[PDB]
Amino acid sequence: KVFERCELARTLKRLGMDGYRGISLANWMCLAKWESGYNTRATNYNAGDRSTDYGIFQINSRYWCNDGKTPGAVNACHLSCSALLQDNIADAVACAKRVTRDPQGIRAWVAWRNRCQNRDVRQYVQGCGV
């Protein structure tokens, strides 16, 4: 599923993402936007380390979900990576929350550092009723 902007903002809000561990909804929107273009079935294989990024938040298989084909990987969200390719984003949200409970917080995603950190992200939630 490819979410429309405001539809996603409200979906994330309902799922408890607004201000989760101090992270604003606009930051989450900026992350999903640059990671997958709001596409839940987005996937990116990393030939260098044999891992794959899954879903709307492009969560990686080396540490967060199990796909059975990533060498010496772990599954911190305790989910099949398939759960990160569903139209319904609840599991992806639970996993994204798990990622941020770690030391880096939202900085775990390099894309957020490149395109969201110290940027004006107000535009992502404007007019969405959140």
Structure resolution, Å: 1.8
For every residue of 33-68, which 3-state class applies, written as one string? HHHHCCECCCEEEECCCCEEEECCCCEECCCCCECC
DSSP conformational letter for 8: H
Structure tokens belonging to residue 17: 């993402």
Nearest by Cα to 130 from 16, 18, 2: 18
51-54 vs 59-60, strand pairing mode: antiparallel
Which residues are marked as active site? 35, 53
* CA 93/CA 16 separation, integer angstroms: 9
CA dihedral angle for residue 71, residue 72, residue 76, residue 79, rounded to 10 degrees? 40
Question: What technique was this entry resolved by?
Answer: X-ray
Report phi then psi at 60, rounded to 5: -80, 140
Residue type, 28: W
* CA 57/CA 106 separation, integer angstroms: 11
Is 20 in a helix, a strand, or coil?
strand
* CA 28/CA 12 separation, integer angstroms: 8
Domains and CATH numbers, the chain: 1-130 (1.10.530.10)
